[PDB]
Amino acid sequence: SLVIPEKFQHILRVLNTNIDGRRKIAFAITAIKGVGRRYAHVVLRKADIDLTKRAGELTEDEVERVITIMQNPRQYKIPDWFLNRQKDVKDGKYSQVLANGLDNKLREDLERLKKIRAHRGLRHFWGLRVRGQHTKTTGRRGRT
Amino acid sequence: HRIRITLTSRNVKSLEKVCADLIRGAKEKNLKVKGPVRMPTKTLRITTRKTPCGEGSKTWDRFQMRIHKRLIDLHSPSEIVKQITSISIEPGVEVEVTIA
Amino acid sequence: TPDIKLFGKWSTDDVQINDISLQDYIAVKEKYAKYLPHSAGRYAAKRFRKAQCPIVERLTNSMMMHGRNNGKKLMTVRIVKHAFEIIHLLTGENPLQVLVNAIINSGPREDSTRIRRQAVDVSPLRRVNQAIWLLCTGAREAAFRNIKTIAECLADELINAAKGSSNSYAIKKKDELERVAKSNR
Amino acid sequence: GRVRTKTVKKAARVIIEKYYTRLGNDFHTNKRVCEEIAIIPSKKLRNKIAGYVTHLMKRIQRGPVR
Amino acid sequence: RDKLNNLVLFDKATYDKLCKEVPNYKLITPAVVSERLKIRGSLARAALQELLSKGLIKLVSKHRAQVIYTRNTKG
Amino acid sequence: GPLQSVQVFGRKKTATAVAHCKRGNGLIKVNGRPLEMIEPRTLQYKLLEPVLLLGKERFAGVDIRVRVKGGGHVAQIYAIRQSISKALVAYYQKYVDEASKKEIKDILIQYDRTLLVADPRRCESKKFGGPGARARYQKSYR
Amino acid sequence: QPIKLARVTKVLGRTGSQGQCTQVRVEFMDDTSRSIIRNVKGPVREGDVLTLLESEREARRL
Amino acid sequence: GVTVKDVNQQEFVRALAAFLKKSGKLKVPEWVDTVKLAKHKELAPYDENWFYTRAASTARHLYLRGGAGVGSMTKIYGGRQRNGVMPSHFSRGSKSVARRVLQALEGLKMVEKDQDGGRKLTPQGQRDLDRIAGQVAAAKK
RNA sequence: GUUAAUUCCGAUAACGAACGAGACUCUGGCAUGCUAACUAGUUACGCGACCCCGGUCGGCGUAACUUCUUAGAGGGACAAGUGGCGUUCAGCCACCCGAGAUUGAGCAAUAACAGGUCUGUGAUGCCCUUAGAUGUCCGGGGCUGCACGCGCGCUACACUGACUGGCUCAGCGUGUGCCUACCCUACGCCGGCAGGCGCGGGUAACCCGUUGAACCCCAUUCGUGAUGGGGAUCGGGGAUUGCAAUUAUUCCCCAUGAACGAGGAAUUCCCAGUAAGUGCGGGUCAUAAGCUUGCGUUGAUUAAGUCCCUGCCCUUUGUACACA
């Protein structure tokens, strides 16, 4: 019942990001950038997935159902308060994009701040804090 | 006719004389009276700078006034109540009369 | 049970204090033994009144260490009730006896003092206090950054201290403190 | 951890000199005797003098006092 | 320097050591068993769940930080 | 007939456990709940110490009802511990012979005096220049 | 070297620099007519038994 | 017979949830298995039947003392607001997820709205609580 | 000699005095005794409801009362007594009984500091400006910048731990304002959430609230991995306060998930509810605690000594010093 099964997977391959199959399903997903400890648990609850098992026992056909939940959050009834790009500037759809598109949708705002030469992008240009922090006392280890 | 009388005084012993005067003032007139309730006091903790400027060690003040309150109920008409409370009043104790 | 008392499920009596030098400072025999070692205090208000406190109580109060365990007495009383269970599951004897043999073998009889470092004799009440600090800390090292929990490290340290095999953390300074005072005298 | 100062000792001695006949041997017996014969400002000061009043009669019961 | 490369499930060469040497072990805890087998501490707790279903080990005093189990009776 | 109402109070730093006794059967309740259910449960024998030192036959005709206001999870352990031990102190002095009353307190004293006398250790005032009652701030030079 | 046992009978004063050692009077229970002078750290009470390794070392009376 | 004051409460919540497992008609909200219980929790429950566990705890606090509405019962289901780098403070529970529990027992007669504010406990809510008290006592025998 | 002490005894060219300490005031645990309590509860019952005569209901109401709630007068401790130490005097140590046989705080002598405050004053000497103003008003920015160093602080560096549920106990307190445009909130609701809509209590033992506050008690998951410890940084989204937040006021959701493996020379605080773990009030506030004053929970190790170091008060002693 708990012995090593057949077709045991060491590392799974989803969205060009390593998933450690040695870990539990609810927390091995969180190693993927763009999904964390909260988003990985809910997508196991939006489908009939028993999260008491490990990531080396679930089938390769079932993870295809899992990844379509992240790729289509609104279509699979994921609440809108789990999405990282709510009310996007360009396309305007509320969605979660995983492990390659998150930085892909991060960076165009950075030259969008360069394209408007605003103060918010100037702190990224100078490599300083942007949320109104204080670098007089901190930020010492990263700067020489 | 269930008239309430409230006693608020800053001092401790000065309020004790007046409430005991009203104890004697109700028995001498022979009316049904509810006892003066020794109702808990409150202390106003004011802790500030002792120093005007910012030079010196950190000392904190300790200011405390303990206002104390009593309530006396009289089962008597209003004419008797105004007869007692209008005689020999001191600055320490305030008098409040409530009909109900 | 009004006539006799039961320490958990262990008996208070049938515990032998073999060393005549440590008879007065182990008050766990029918005078200060209690069912559970929780109390309010008042033992350390005076000088020698903490010696009348039982050594089981003194050991559980010596786990109250390093802040995050401070303010938590329901840790150590729950720990020591489980720590006495694991001791019986390996040796089989009364675990109150094991603690008595643990105190004797873990305290060095002879240490150094500052008057260059010079060596003089040490008091039996001094020895039981420093023995308790040495062996309670020994459980803390083996349970820190380790898979094993504190209740087994405390049990695994008390067993060997009743034998004296020089693997315990308290026994290690029992060799160290005695030997440095042997040369520095 | 207790020493009778000059204020306590001057109040206790003059009481014994003038009012010998009214004092007893137990602390509480002559404690209220000192209440009526002097004007004591506080509760604490009455008990402080009266202990040394009783402490001196144990010296008197031993023998003469200088 | 050192890394605890513990197992997540039980191999066939290690599952038989659970059925033979753990019955010869006097002390049954999820820490000593995990140390002597190089497995997860939580894995040893799941191994105790199947053994109590097997009815071979007896519990002494359970707690959330450490579960305690003992051997069968000698006679 | 005779209302055997014995109101006995016991004090802690904040917990004031007041054990009300009566004539009846051997059941003890604290705000309805018995002594068997007060968290923490690890000090289970601590709450039954009067039972584990004096016997059930004494408490056979006594039922204890306790009201508790204030304290903590550990203060209420020792507040009820002295309240029901002193609940039978005033039960046996007014109604039955003092011959029973003199032997009982000798047994209770021999275990610990906390069962009869309240601990007067309270939280003294925090002082200016410190985060606690005695501690001072971390003063630094230059 | 044999190890004897000693019992505290008297304390004279606090020795050392910080007063963390005590001048101790001991008597050997193997022979009550033989007694030596040493120092003991920590709290010392009159009338309790300690353990002494050897009598070759002798403290000087200050 | 015995009341809720004699039964072990840490298994009574499972026993009361087992009473809720048999019926299963409390009109569970849709967003239950994906919402956080408070504004200061970090994570989601490990069990997928936490609503029937939390609804069991709501019916027994009103049993001990009624007249507590939604805004006052956020305190019992509150706790540490660990902001992280800030020192932790006490935070009240969320409104809607706590409010829907009282709505789940309002349709079918487990609770009734108390006069002058609060949630009283209807008599049908106290037959079943005392009746299952003897079931656990039989299980503890 | 003794004391925490110039504290006293006792010698004595000292005597008579005086201050400081002491004394005085506030608070804490002891009060089954008084006064009172319908702005608090207790005991009994009337009902109503549950389970099989009994148990529960801060569910209602009532014949008494203060044991639990509170404050007035108070009383209670004084070494009072005993045994040892000491001129056996000042006094000291341990013990019986008793809630205390050394609770904490306020005040705190003469005299001085070239310490700070002219930026607290319609408290002020002298000097400056006074019309193109160092007077006043409005708009914006800074006081928040950053190779760096230092200090007061919070968080952790994880299995005595993290998470998720069940659970359970506080008193300091505070609450609608002259101007003042500004209160604490109960309840049902919309929404996960911050927030929004209706009513109502409370100028306060009436209402928030019987302050269901945390670590801690119990049950699952975690398993030595810088990993579910850690939350620094960063992006997207929702509202509050504000006319105005951009330099993210402030909070809520998801996500990003760094260093940190118990910290060198050194240095800080503390000894009985004590250090410390932990939470809640007040000032700071339109929006607001990473500060601080209070209060509450949990609650220890060691010692009851010393001048070794660092400081304080005397006597003798030598001085070429006397802003010493």
Swiss-Prot record, chain B:
Posttranslational mods: Polyubiquitinated by ZNF598 via 'Lys-63'-linked ubiquitin chains when a ribosome has stalled, initiating the ribosome quality control (RQC) pathway to degrade the potentially detrimental aberrant nascent polypeptide. Deubiquitinated by OTUD3 and USP21, antagonizing ZNF598 activity. Ufmylated by UFL1.
Keyword set includes Phosphoprotein: yes
Task: Give residues where N6-acetyllysine occurs.
Answer: 17, 58
Q: Give any GO molecular function from the UniProt entry.
A: RNA binding
Gene Ontology biological-process entries: translation
Q: Name one GO cellular component term.
A: cytosolic ribosome
Q: Quote the subcellular location field of this record.
A: Cytoplasm
Q: Which UniProt keywords are present, listed alphabetically?
A: Acetylation, Cytoplasm, Isopeptide bond, Phosphoprotein, Ribonucleoprotein, Ribosomal protein, Ubl conjugation
Q: Extract the coiled-coil ranges from the record.
A: none
Q: What is its main location?
A: cytoplasm
Phosphoserine modification, residue list: 76
Highest taxon of the source? Eukaryota
State whether it acts alone or in a complex, and with which partners, per the record: Component of the 40S small ribosomal subunit.
Q: Belongs to which family?
A: Belongs to the universal ribosomal protein uS10 family.
Function recorded in the entry:
Component of the small ribosomal subunit. The ribosome is a large ribonucleoprotein complex responsible for the synthesis of proteins in the cell.
User: What's the protein here called?
Assistant: Small ribosomal subunit protein uS10
* UniProt organism field: Oryctolagus cuniculus
Shown segment, full-protein numbering: 18 to 117 of 119
Swiss-Prot record, chain C:
Q: Which locations, inside or outside the cell, does it occupy?
A: Cytoplasm; Nucleus, Nucleolus
GO biological process, any: translation
Please give the superkingdom of this protein's source. Answer: Eukaryota
Nucleus recorded as keyword: yes
Asked if the Swiss-Prot or TrEMBL record annotates the protein with the keyword Lyase, the reply is: no
Q: Where are the transmembrane segments?
A: none
Q: Which Pfam families match?
A: Ribosomal_S7
Write down what this protein is called: Small ribosomal subunit protein uS7
Q: Which organism is it from?
A: Oryctolagus cuniculus
Report which gene this protein is encoded by: RPS5
From Swiss-Prot, chain D:
Question: Mind listing the UniProt keywords for this protein, alphabetically?
Answer: Cytoplasm, Isopeptide bond, Nucleus, Phosphoprotein, Ribonucleoprotein, Ribosomal protein, Ubl conjugation
So what does this one do?
A: Component of the small ribosomal subunit. The ribosome is a large ribonucleoprotein complex responsible for the synthesis of proteins in the cell. Part of the small subunit (SSU) processome, first precursor of the small eukaryotic ribosomal subunit. During the assembly of the SSU processome in the nucleolus, many ribosome biogenesis factors, an RNA chaperone and ribosomal proteins associate with the nascent pre-rRNA and work in concert to generate RNA folding, modifications, rearrangements and cleavage as well as targeted degradation of pre-ribosomal RNA by the RNA exosome.
Main location as per UniProt = cytoplasm
Give the family from UniProt. Answer: Belongs to the eukaryotic ribosomal protein eS17 family.
According to its record, what are the GO cellular component terms? Answer: cytosolic ribosome; nucleolus; ribonucleoprotein complex
Quaternary state and interactors = Component of the small ribosomal subunit. Part of the small subunit (SSU) processome, composed of more than 70 proteins and the RNA chaperone small nucleolar RNA (snoRNA) U3.
Describe which stretch of the whole protein the shown chain covers, with first residue, last residue and complete length.
Answer: 2 to 67 of 135
Domain of life, per UniProt, equals: Eukaryota
The molecular function terms of the Gene Ontology recorded here are: structural constituent of ribosome
Would you kindly state one Gene Ontology biological process term found in this protein's UniProt entry?
translation
**N6-succinyllysine sites (modified residues):** 18
Species of the source: Oryctolagus cuniculus
Give the protein name, as stated in the record: Small ribosomal subunit protein eS17
Location(s) in or outside the cell: Cytoplasm; Nucleus, Nucleolus
From Swiss-Prot, chain E:
Indicate where the modification N6-acetyllysine is found in the sequence: 3, 12, 20, 26, 54
Gene Ontology molecular function = structural constituent of ribosome
Membrane: is it a keyword of this entry?
Answer: no
Domain of life of the native organism = Eukaryota
The N6-succinyllysine modification is found at: 12, 54
What's an example Gene Ontology biological process for this entry? rRNA processing
Keyword list, A-Z: Acetylation, Cytoplasm, Ribonucleoprotein, Ribosomal protein
List, alphabetically, the GO terms of the cellular component aspect.
cytosolic ribosome; cytosolic small ribosomal subunit; nucleolus; postsynaptic density
Kindly indicate whether the keyword Acetylation belongs to this entry.
yes
Compartment(s) of residence: Cytoplasm
Give the function comment from the record.
Answer: Component of the small ribosomal subunit. The ribosome is a large ribonucleoprotein complex responsible for the synthesis of proteins in the cell.
Subunit comment: Component of the small ribosomal subunit.
Family of the protein in this entry: Belongs to the eukaryotic ribosomal protein eS25 family.
Q: What protein name applies here?
A: Small ribosomal subunit protein eS25
Which species is this record about?
Oryctolagus cuniculus
Whole-protein coverage range: 40 to 114 of 124
